[PDB]
């Protein structure tokens, strides 16, 4: 990992290293600005059709342009001993994923919470109208800027038209669409509120099963200060039946902005 990709993007700190890539905080030497570069796990997973998933992820996010969605600025690959090293240059978000905020602060204030996810909705609704589906919406792919701004960031598994956060439909290879993301955000909205996903399981299958077989314990019954009006929103988006939940993410937001003010949720039960 040449601390100087293509001789232009000076690598610095390490913002994170998963099981596929290593994201570094870099310096664009030409534009004198800080950027976040994503590097395909130094060849350890660069020979297979994995490079495709990477190239097609850079371009699947490059197709979108919205504040809440991390922008892509450039792609490429630098040459190194073992071969090509595909990198992606994104906007830098000095922040924290929600996975973190829910780990060192516990649950978010209902209103704080409502606020975030409503912004996340705005990003997905856009992503949708542009024919992109983020098949991977989880607390670890939504970031909170150092100025409390929301950023949605992982498209590695997104297709243009760890299952604690997957939809029944997406559980199997079934129908995965707009509403799937809608169902996912419902889990996030749920964790940021209780401090946990609607369903916990010792093994993946027990969880999947729970998603498509058990009603999500109402938020109120799971945590303190929870407006049974907020329950109406959470449990709606978590409805096992696509048709019975919000059809668009803007429709979900609409019912979040409602609760945020003081209005009645146009959600049932
Ligand atoms: N633009 C960015 N700015 C700051 N940190 C970022 C940025 N993009 C990613 N990160 C950090 O890098 C971590 C890994 O991001 P991902 O893109 O989801 O990683 P990944 O290699 O796809 O790992 P997986 O497959 O999602 S488990 C994040 O959870 C952040 O801490
Ligand atoms: Mg991640
Ligand atoms: Mg990914």
Swiss-Prot record:
Disulfide bonds: none annotated. Coiled coil: none annotated. ATP binds at residues 15-23, 38, 91-93, 138-141, 154. Residues 9-257 form the Protein kinase domain. Autophosphorylated. Dephosphorylated by PstP. Residues 1-269 are cytoplasmic. The PASTA domains interact with peptidoglycans and are required for PknB localization. Protein kinase that regulates many aspects of mycobacterial physiology. Is a key component of a signal transduction pathway that regulates cell growth, cell shape and cell division via phosphorylation of target proteins. This is Serine/threonine-protein kinase PknB. The chain holds residues 3 to 286 of 626 of the full protein.
């Amino acid at each position: 990992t040449p601390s100087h990709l293509s001789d232009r993007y000076e690598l610095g700190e390490i913002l994170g290293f998963g099981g596929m890539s290593e994201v570094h905080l870099a310096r664009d030497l030409r534009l004198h600005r800080d950027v976040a570069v994503k590097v395909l796990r130094a060849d350890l997973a660069r020979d297979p059709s994995f490079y495709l998933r990477f190239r097609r992820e850079a371009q699947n996010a490059a197709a979108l342009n919205h504040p809440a969605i991390v922008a892509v600025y450039d792609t490429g690959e630098a040459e190194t001993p073992a071969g090509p090293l595909p990198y992606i240059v994104m906007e830098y978000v000095d922040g924290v994923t929600l996975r973190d905020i829910v780990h060192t602060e516990g649950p978010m204030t209902p209103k704080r919470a409502i606020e975030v996810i409503a912004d996340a909705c705005q990003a997905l609704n856009f992503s949708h109208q542009n024919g992109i589906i983020h098949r991977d919406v989880k607390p670890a792919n939504i970031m909170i800027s150092a100025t409390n701004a929301v950023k949605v960031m992982d498209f590695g598994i997104a297709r243009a038209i760890t299952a604690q956060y997957l939809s029944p439909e997406q559980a199997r290879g079934d129908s995965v669409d707009a509403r799937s993301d809608v169902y996912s955000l419902g889990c996030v909205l749920y964790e940021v509120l209780t401090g946990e996903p609607p369903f916990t399981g010792d093994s993946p299958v027990s969880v999947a099963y729970q998603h498509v077989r058990e009603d999500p314990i109402p938020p109120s019954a799971r945590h303190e200060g929870l407006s049974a009006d907020l329950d109406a929103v959470v449990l709606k988006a978590l409805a096992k039946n696509p048709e019975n939940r919000y059809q668009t993410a803007a429709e979900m937001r609409a019912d979040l902005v409602r609760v945020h003010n003081g209005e009645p949720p146009e959600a049932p039960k």
